[PDB]
Amino acid sequence: ERDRVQKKTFTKWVNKHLIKHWRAEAQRHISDLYEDLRDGHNLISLLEVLSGDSLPREKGRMRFHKLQNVQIALDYLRHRQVKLVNIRNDDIADGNPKLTLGLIWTIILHFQISDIQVSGQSEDMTAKEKLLLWSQRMVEGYQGLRCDNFTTSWRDGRLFNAIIHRHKPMLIDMNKVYRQTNLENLDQAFSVAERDLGVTRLLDPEDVDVPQPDEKSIITYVSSLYDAMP
């Protein structure tokens, strides 16, 4: 299901950032997203690295120290005009999945997805509508591949390869692309983007070759491409 994939994707995204913390003790790794954010420490760390700001933190063990640290993170975001539609400290401290996923998505949008500007876009297209237009424009010439959406259109790997073939034309062979299975095409795309473009592998080939790829995870990964070659 799309939610286990989303947890998955979100977890790697958060970890990529955690380990670049400037402070050693904060350089942590999450195993389960629905446990390892509860105490608020990694949420605060994640906001520290993404913003470069130094945030207060509460050291102890206690239940209400978890709450305090979540509140510091939520308060940070609210002070930056992020609409936390309604989340309490509790939701995160208790490990609620929907809201924990929602909070991470909100952070991904705010910090990563929302700077997407492309030339000749419309005024009130969304930031996802703007990414889409970029993706389309990135493959305008390749022979009858559409990008219509951030799900089914990505399933066979063609889009990703075609995108990477725009400055590593040398590293991928689009011909083999139209001969390869979905899985081969995904692995390759994702392994090329890591080695030669500096793009962390957020998705597994298995997560994407399914009838309905999870829209947020695909957007997270494709945003990451955009960041490497706009």
From Swiss-Prot:
Chain segments carrying region Actin-binding: 1-230
Family, as annotated: Belongs to the plakin or cytolinker family.
Residues of the full protein shown: 182 to 411 of 4691
Organ and tissue specificity: Detected in eye lens fiber cells (at protein level). Expressed at high levels in lung, brain, small intestine, muscle, heart and skin with lower levels found in kidney, liver, uterus, spleen and salivary gland.
Superkingdom: Eukaryota
Location relative to the cell: Cytoplasm, Cytoskeleton; Cell junction, Hemidesmosome; Cell projection, Podosome
Modifications the protein undergoes after translation, according to the UniProt entry: Phosphorylated by CDK1; regulates dissociation from intermediate filaments during mitosis.
Function: Interlinks intermediate filaments with microtubules and microfilaments and anchors intermediate filaments to desmosomes or hemidesmosomes. May be involved not only in the cross-linking and stabilization of cytoskeletal intermediate filaments network, but also in the regulation of their dynamics.
Record domain Calponin-homology (CH): where: 4-112, 125-230
Domain free text: The N-terminus interacts with actin, the C-terminus with vimentin, desmin, GFAP, cytokeratins, lamin B; whereas both the N- and the C-terminus can bind integrin beta-4.
Protein name, per record: Plectin
Organism, scientific name: Mus musculus
Subunit structure: Homodimer or homotetramer. Interacts (via actin-binding domain) with SYNE3. Interacts (via calponin-homology (CH) 1 domain) with VIM (via rod region). Interacts (via N-terminus) with DST isoform 2 (via N-terminus). Interacts with FER. Interacts with TOR1A. Interacts with ANK3. Identified in complexes that contain VIM, EZR, AHNAK, BFSP1, BFSP2, ANK2, PLEC, PRX and spectrin.
